[PDB]
Amino acid sequence: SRFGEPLMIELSVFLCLLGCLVCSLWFLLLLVIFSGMLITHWIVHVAVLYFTHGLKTSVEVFIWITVVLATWVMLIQTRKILEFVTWTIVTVLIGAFLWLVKTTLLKILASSFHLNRFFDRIQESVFHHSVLQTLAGAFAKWVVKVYNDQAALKHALNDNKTAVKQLNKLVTAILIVMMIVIWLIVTGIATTKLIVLLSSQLVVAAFIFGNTCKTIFEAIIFVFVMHPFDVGDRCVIDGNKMLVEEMNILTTVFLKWDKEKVYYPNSILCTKAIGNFFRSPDQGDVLEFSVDFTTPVLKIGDLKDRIKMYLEQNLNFWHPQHNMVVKEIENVNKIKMALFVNHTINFQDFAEKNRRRSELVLELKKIFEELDIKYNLLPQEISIRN
Amino acid sequence: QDFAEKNRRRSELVLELKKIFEELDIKYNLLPQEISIRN
Amino acid sequence: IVLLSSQLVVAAFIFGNTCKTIFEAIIFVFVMHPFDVGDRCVIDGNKMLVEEMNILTTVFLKWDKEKVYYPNSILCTKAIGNFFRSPDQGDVLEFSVDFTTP
Amino acid sequence: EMNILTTVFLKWDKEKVYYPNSILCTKAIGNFFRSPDQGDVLEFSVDFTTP
Amino acid sequence: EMNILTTVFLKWDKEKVYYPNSILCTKAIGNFFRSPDQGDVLEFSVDFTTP
Amino acid sequence: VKVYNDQAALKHALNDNKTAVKQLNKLVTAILIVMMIVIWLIVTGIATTKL
Ligand SMILES: CCCCCCCCCCCCCCCC(=O)O
Ligand SMILES: CCCCCCCCCCCCCCCC(=O)O
Ligand SMILES: CCCCCCCCCCCCCCCC(=O)O
Ligand SMILES: CCCCCCCCCCCCCCCC(=O)O
């Protein structure tokens, strides 16, 4: 596991000049320009940071084609051949448009997923590594924590890139297919019988792949929009405290307290209430106990006072705020009580939580012995027959 | 809305009930058990 | 125009159910409006403080401050208690005494 | 209170509860207000040997 | 064995069990083979007066 | 003889994890054949439009 483990190449400038040289008069000059008009788009782009760098090339294609179609329209059985060509160009532009849309949406999703959530953890990681580099020119525990946190960020970053690439493949594939169909029908190539068969194929597919498409969509919303947890977070699902090992579109992989690896479908996880200790504020806890009904109220008062002193001597572990609650009188034999305390940590480090609680439980033991707090069973009257 | 406060007030009432039972000598006892001994 | 409309129909067929869910969540948040941020609510016996409200999810803190994310698509079908909006509340102390108590 | 989408109830300890009509309408609902005089039961036990 | 419609498993007592994949598709599945070294717990109790 | 018996055991151990693929192949092929029948009927013009 990742967590829990024990020459032509640069001839474009020249090519562009050669293309310009192609005409100096007349009507076909725009058509000729199209052959190397990409250079013009590149220059326009130069003339025109995450989105900018990632999208400029998609924009260039879109506008490039738009111009080619516009000049084509204004340029002019060759009669039917040209109708065909015109529509082919239109289809190509539609394709580029959709391409641009697709790219944009994935860039938004991919970026906002992390940029608006853990920017600050990245900066903390950089800081600590700068410090380690400087130092080189409980210390060891600190050093290990710094490396483990960096690894966690690397894993989150890689899983996001992967998930987005998977989305990219699904969308690209459907986009390509629909563009083929669009081309065939707008150009007039497909005939009535072909339209009928394509129509049927789509309808049938709509049923077959219906649940699949819905499931993927819901999984995307769960993972990227709701985002109840990240990689490495300790989460609670139906009472199971589990560490998130990996996130994917269809599944989330978790490690149980005993490090069993669990594959948990997102289509199920989407309907559950999910806890997240990593994202929690300092967490609290409870120690329940019972005392005899005859315990003097003064000993109850001494118990409260002794507990307060303990907690105040250990402020690295406990917040000063606590409550002692008397809850119930059972028969006239038992008083049920509970101690409510506040930890100075959240529970991402579960073992540390238990160690601190364990000491508090032993302190309670000690206080009861010193104050002579006891619990007795009710007496039983016996009658003897011979 | 404030649970800690609710419980503090309730705890005092529970301890008052304790006090009243002691002052009025109110008790609970288990049913007697008859034993036959065959040695 | 026809081709565009045709695909909207197909998309509806396939994703209409997720859109339905989002819409239902909108009605829960803005029309039913069972709670606000900072209120203590009771869901399935769990007394939780509302920390954040969103369209798709509600974030709550449990008594031990564990942060919990509930889909609104689930809260829409539950009965929700709200202590903030409640009038003065009552309580019970149960006990038992000997039969022979005068 | 009553509304179209949800009914609001108070429990015996007066917490206020929002209860969707979409779930409430599939439950059997008792109504004490509309009820006739109601009955009750005291259960108890005695020794077998009681004459 | 694995097939498209069903998965065949052996229980600890080697009973052969046939699961529809359509139901496994909705379950959380543990996999020991793929797991890192696993941990364990021994629970016990002692007298309160143990020093 | 041990070498050949071990070779056989290994070939089976490896082939046992590919049974789902073989099943998918049969399914895909059946679909593909049907698609080609339909294509033949249409591309040669033998089918008419009412049918
Ligand atoms: C259902 C159509 C495919 C869905 C999109 C591609 C896969 C999305 C990611 C899900 C996890 C699959 C890849 C990891 C498998 C593994 O554990 O080796
Ligand atoms: C009719 C549905 C179409 C829109 C599909 C996109 C998903 C709905 C809008 C998401 C709004 C943000 C939800 C809260 C996210 C958060 O928990 O921070
Ligand atoms: C999908 C549309 C839902 C809106 C139509 C129903 C109108 C609201 C019904 C009452 C429930 C909300 C209470 C609002 C307060 C009020 O106006 O009395
Ligand atoms: C060709 C369509 C048949 C309908 C059933 C769909 C699955 C294709 C057939 C592959 C076999 C599925 C597993 C059954 C167990 C076995 O083969 O022994």
Author numbering:
A (entry chain A): 96 to 101, 186 to 204, 222 to 244, 258 to 285, 294 to 354, 503 to 751
B (entry chain G): 713 to 751
C (entry chain G): 560 to 661
D (entry chain F), E (entry chain B): 611 to 661
F (entry chain B): 509 to 559
Could you share sentences copied from the article?
Flycatcher1 (FLYC1), a MscS homolog, has recently been identified as a candidate mechanosensitive (MS) ion channel involved in Venus flytrap prey recognition. FLYC1 comprises a homoheptamer with six TMs (TM1–TM6) per protomer and intracellular N and C termini. A glycine-containing hinge (G575) splits TM6 into two halves (TM6a and TM6b), and the β-rich C-termini of the FLYC1 protomers come together to form a hollow cytoplasmic cage.
A composite map was obtained from merging the C1 reconstruction and focused classification maps in a 6 up to 1 down protomer ratio, based on visible density from the C1 reconstruction. Topologically unique cytoplasmic flanking regions can adopt ‘up’ or ‘down’ conformations, making the channel asymmetric. Based on the composite ‘6 up 1 down’ model, we carried out additional MD simulations in the presence of negative membrane potentials of −450, −225, and −112.5 mV. The pore radius at the start is ~10% wider for the composite model at 3.1 Å radius, compared to the ‘all-up’ model. We also note that the pore constriction geometry across these three simulations is more well-preserved when the composite model was used. The wider pore constriction is accompanied by an increased number of chloride ion crossing events over the same simulation timescale, with a conductance estimation much closer to the electrophysiological measurements of the stretch-activated currents. Our MD simulations support the idea of passage of chloride in an ‘all-up’ state at −425 mV and a ‘6 up 1 down’ state at −450 mV, with the latter exhibiting an estimated conductance closer to electrophysiology measurements. Our observation that the channel adopts asymmetric assemblies with protomers adopting either up or down states is likely to add further complexity to the FLYC1 gating mechanism.
